[PDB]
Design a protein around this ligand. Sequence first.
Ligand SMILES: C[C@H](CCC(=O)O)[C@H]1CC[C@H]2[C@@H]3CC[C@@H]4C[C@H](O)CC[C@]4(C)[C@H]3C[C@H](O)[C@]12C
Ligand SMILES: CCCCCCCCCCCC[N+](C)(C)[O-]
Length: 392
Amino acid sequence: ARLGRQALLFPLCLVLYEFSTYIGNDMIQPGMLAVVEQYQAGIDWVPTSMTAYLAGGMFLQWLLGPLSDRIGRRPVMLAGVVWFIVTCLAILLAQNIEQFTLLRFLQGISLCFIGAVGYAAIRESFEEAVCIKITALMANVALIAPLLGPLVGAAWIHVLPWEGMFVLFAALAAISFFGLQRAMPETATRIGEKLSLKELGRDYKLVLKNGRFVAGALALGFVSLPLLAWIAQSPIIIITGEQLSSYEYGLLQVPIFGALIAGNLLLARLTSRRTVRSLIIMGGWPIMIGLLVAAAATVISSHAYLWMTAGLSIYAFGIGLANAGLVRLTLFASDMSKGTVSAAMGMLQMLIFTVGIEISKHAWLNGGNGLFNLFNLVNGILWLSLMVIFLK
Ligand SMILES: C[C@H](CCC(=O)O)[C@H]1CC[C@H]2[C@@H]3CC[C@@H]4C[C@H](O)CC[C@]4(C)[C@H]3C[C@H](O)[C@]12C
Ligand SMILES: CCCCCCCCCCCC[N+](C)(C)[O-]
């Protein structure tokens, strides 16, 4: 029974779970100033919270798709949601910033269930028509989270304890659990079949031998790093570094993630008249200019954070315009199984984000805003360099 009238509870709950894991990062980052204060830990642990969450994402990423294909998408997906609930609640017991961070890593493992199993089940459960719309809703949730998250998170710790946020993530995921339990059908085709790890390994060695695919996958990591570095470090840059208020922290998010959204909106209006190569080249202009603006300004004066914010906004507009197209070309740069190709590009991005956020951290700690933005600029140049190869 492809799709249905009453079968929309399944994708809706999947979306709710997706949202909960996304704010599980985006609400937490501004809350990390309170966390670090509670544990009497240094501010260098603030970005690391995100680093750890992301690192957990790439842990089972290569695994879940083929495994869920064998044991069923239903038990694996439900397992992931429960694991998220449990680890969200468990972090309330952490006792130090090291154990807090460990639990961030453990929580982050829940991230890869979305794409590798839930989404695979969506594609198998639904007519392309309905599937396309569900994908859009999911993409829209991913767009709303980094805008809504820091605002709601900043508003939260002003009143309520950081522990409450984790109870909220768990509560939302619990709702999605019971919905998925009653709704989500079993779409796995390979149930009962044997799973060869050595053969899985060979599939990954093969995707990684494709140079054009690797360039696009790496490019996607590099180009999105400045944005994630901002998400990771904006609380310490703004509140600790510029000694600004929480209200200003929230306000600075508006042009940046508003621009991201606006770039996506322009993308939607232009898609029928452009194609992908031209849209990547088009987004390339604000991507490079915005990063150049943030870097130049903060090298001139370390404290010009409005110019930094402006440059990041311009860059974010380009990202909204360029990224989705590069995702598409990268996926089809390899003719191997889409599950494998997807997981591979997911892991390569997370590798870059994890290491890149930590490097960004040391950049800012040592050099301030100038270094933060200069590192972001090199990342833009890496993307650009890969694009001249990828597009030729
Ligand atoms: C890249 C993968 C999956 C996409 C893919 O496989 O192509 C995704 C899945 C989970 C996603 C993260 C969820 C938490 C964060 C939400 C933020 O609002 C945007 C940055 C983060 C850090 C996301 C970045 C990226 O979008 C991660 C790793
Ligand atoms: C019609 C030609 C292909 C027939 C051979 C199929 C055998 C099973 C392959 C399973 C898929 C996994 N792998 C590792 C090959 O990528």
